[PDB]
Design an enzyme around this catalytic site. Structure first.
Site: not given
Ligand SMILES: Cc1cc2nc3c(=O)[nH]c(=O)nc-3n(C[C@H](O)[C@H](O)[C@H](O)COP(=O)(O)OP(=O)(O)OC[C@H]3O[C@@H](n4cnc5c(N)ncnc54)[C@H](O)[C@@H]3O)c2cc1C
Ligand SMILES: Cc1cc2nc3c(=O)[nH]c(=O)nc-3n(C[C@H](O)[C@H](O)[C@H](O)COP(=O)(O)OP(=O)(O)OC[C@H]3O[C@@H](n4cnc5c(N)ncnc54)[C@H](O)[C@@H]3O)c2cc1C
Ligand SMILES: O=S([O-])[O-]
Ligand SMILES: O=S([O-])[O-]
Ligand SMILES: O=S([O-])[O-]
Lengths: 394, 394
Positions: B72, B201, B293, B297, B385
């Site tokens: 991604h 998200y 969550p 990570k 991220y």
């Protein structure tokens, strides 16, 4: 599910609290992770304090103990080739201790709970505690493929040292106190008659040794061994030979040896957490503390924690004095610390510690001579051994 | 038994450390309490950082990931009816994340370890650690009816949050840091195609929601729910309806719904212990920390702890620089805390917190608008991220 007091763990602590609550008309449910046979599979001896004996009776579970239990009016400590008897009964005014194994006590409790139909869920996996600081706490667990919830007013964590209850308290609220001893106890259970009708704690240059009995037909012996010892390196004959070597000749002489039914090495450690509660959750027994085996106080502290909690719960449910539950930890801890102190004292005067100098060795021998040769000293041992009086609430 | 590095736990942390050690010529043994099928039975998704992907490759276990993994280049955050894309690749200079489930990663590692014949003992019960502060530590455990001992130079505790390794460190040496969030994640795994090729998200007044995928053929969705919710009260249709309600219409419109292969509610918590070592024992992964969550990570911190430990071990065994192992905790913790910080930030801007006032609500919306509308803000999200660079030893 719904109950008044949720009880995590079906060992001695949980079973005794639940049976006491049962007789008092207070709804309770016990959630046990293992199976009935698994719990009963743990073979443990026991030397019950008067206080615990009374509690079991109050629980209505004393018939078999009264029949198979062994009442001891004294205990002995051997050192420098001599046997010194401490007359517990006389030194305390009439109190004694009863030799009846934890296994038997647990069995008796399970039969009584099973007979009265009180609720117990064995094989309750993934137990989790929730909303402890609210007035409506609840427990979740998984049994036979399904997720179940148990709503209650209070939760008693009687799930042992490796239970989930202590872990459910924020570490920032707890203070841990611990000590590990530089040795373990090699034990051997036999079907031979005991060498004595009363226990014999022995101090010897080669190390500590204990002559005891699990029942009227089972003998239990122990010898101190270093932490790295392998039970496999200890044949029965080697054990018997070392044991006799640590005892006065008159005792080692009349000792009856035989094949061992079981053998293992147990470590000696101390552990105490403060406080022993958080919100509606209260810890009791091994979930809150561990004491070395030397005083045989482990099972007895479990009993006294349960007595205090039970008595405080009655106050809450029958007098609307639930605020008193806030004093649970302080009351238990005062007794736990004195029990840790006494066990520590017994351990220190009976064992051989590594790298100990001449002065330390002499001081240890003198501790034994002073305490066993003084009425006041003898009294301090006796009152502690039979167990101090349970502190009345308030 | 004798080995150079004893490894407690055969989850991702343990398996990866052992395979890395295996390829480096460093003897190692993994002791796992459960069975192979039991470990493989835990179905977990995953979003791998570049660092972890490289580590798996270095481990020689990347063939299947390269074939089935989903690379991604971006991730999306939805709020106020709009979809805001964060171009990870562009914002980081070329770094990406790979969507490949922990289950698959674990399987790949087990096959590689099984194939090379490295030592792994499943169903190793009663694991206990000994002499951690000496130069000859060892582990004891019981397997297939017998007591076994494992001598080693170092012990890596990769036994998860409820393992025995963290509990084998004196509480007086550890400092615990924790936080529990006032909500959980209701998840639903399906075989329907994902609504998007990149994760989404979403922040919505009704609560948080996440559109993700476990694999190219499995979709994974989540919706924030209060801690007391019962998975049983949530039928698939209720879940789908709530999910769509928290997403922009354009997304909810093209979403494909279907029967759920699995459903459950997961709590969100943070946990960190300092230090993460004691003597010859080093903790890695969940045994040392837990992150919510939200940042995905958890698996990535397990990877980085293992990378640091592995690299420090090489230094010890190949340069006689074992003293550097003393810096293990400080290095890992610096990365763990930044990961906890970033996860906390993501959680706080995406979720609906109870009893939150108007100002808090507005500040949250502004956090999203500022960060997603600023190149600098976008960069802070992107670098975190895809994962910060692993700190080089020394
Ligand atoms: C080998 C050995 C010998 C000993 N001998 C003596 C002795 O002679 N005398 C003496 O006084 N003391 C002795 N002790 C100590 C004594 O046995 C304990 O103090 C006593 O068992 C404490 O009882 P308890 O019910 O509080 O804990 P436990 O007996 O440990 O019972 C706790 C129960 O909770 C269950 N549980 C654990 N986790 C969970 C969970 N997550 N959910 C649900 N249930 C759970 C357990 O399966 C267990 O049934 C000995 C200890 C050992 C290990
Ligand atoms: C439902 C769920 C979903 C998650 N989804 C994600 C996700 O999508 N992405 C992400 O990054 N993170 C996620 N996480 C977290 C992530 O799975 C963990 O961070 C990861 O499992 C840590 O790996 P580990 O090997 O360190 O610990 P674990 O995976 O827990 O492995 C530890 C191993 O040690 C064994 N063990 C335990 N005690 C003993 C003992 N006494 N002796 C021997 N062995 C023992 C265990 O059986 C286990 O195999 C999720 C967690 C849960 C619970
Ligand atoms: O859920 S609590 O800590 O009341
Ligand atoms: O019973 S266990 O695996 O804690
Ligand atoms: O046994 S220890 O703590 O070196």
């Amino acid at each position: 599910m719904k109950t008044q007091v949720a009880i995590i763990g079906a060992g001695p602590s949980g079973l005794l609290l639940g049976q006491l609550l049962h007789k008092a008309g207070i709804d309770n449910v016990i959630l046990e992770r293992q199976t009935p046979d698994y719990v009963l599979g743990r073979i443990r001896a026991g030397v019950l304090e008067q206080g615990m004996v009374d509690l079991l009776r109050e629980a209505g579970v004393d018939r078999r103990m009264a029949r198979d239990g062994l009442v001891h009016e004294g205990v002995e400590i051997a050192f420098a080739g001599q046997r010194r008897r401490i007359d517990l009964k006389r030194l305390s005014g009439g109190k004694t201790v009863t030799v009846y194994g934890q296994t038997e006590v647990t069995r008796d409790l399970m039969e009584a709970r099973e007979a009265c139909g009180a609720t117990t869920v064995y094989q309750a996996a993934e137990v989790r505690l929730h909303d402890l600081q609210g007035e409506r706490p609840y427990v979740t667990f998984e049994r036979d493929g399904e997720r179940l919830r148990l709503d209650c007013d209070y939760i008693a964590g009687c799930d042992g040292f490796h239970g989930i209850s202590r872990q459910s308290i924020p570490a920032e609220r707890l203070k841990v106190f611990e000590r590990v001893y530089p040795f373990g106890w090699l034990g051997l259970l036999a079907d031979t008659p005991p060498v004595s009708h009363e226990l014999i704690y022995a101090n010897h240059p080669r190390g500590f040794a204990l002559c005891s009995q699990r029942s009227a037909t089972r003998s239990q012996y122990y010898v101190q061994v270093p932490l790295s010892e392998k039970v496999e390196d200890w044949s029965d004959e080697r054990f018997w030979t070392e044991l006799k070597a640590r005892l006065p000749s008159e005792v080692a002489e009349k000792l009856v040896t035989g094949p061992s039914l079981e053998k293992s090495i147990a470590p000696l450690r101390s552990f105490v957490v403060e406080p022993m509660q958080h919100g509606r959750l209260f810890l009791a027994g091994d979930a809150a503390h561990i004491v070395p085996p030397t005083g045989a106080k482990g099972l007895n502290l479990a009993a006294s924690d349960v007595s205090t909690l039970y008595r405080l719960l009655l106050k809450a449910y029958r007098e609307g004095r639930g605020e008193l539950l806030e004093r649970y930890s302080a009351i238990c801890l005062r007794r736990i610390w004195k029990a840790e102190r006494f066990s520590w004292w017994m351990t220190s005067v009976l064992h051989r510690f590594p790298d100990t100098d001449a002065f330390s060795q002499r001081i240890q021998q003198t501790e034994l001579e002073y305490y066993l040769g003084s009425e006041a000293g003898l009294a301090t041992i006796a009152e502690n051994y039979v167990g101090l009086p349970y502190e009345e609430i308030e």
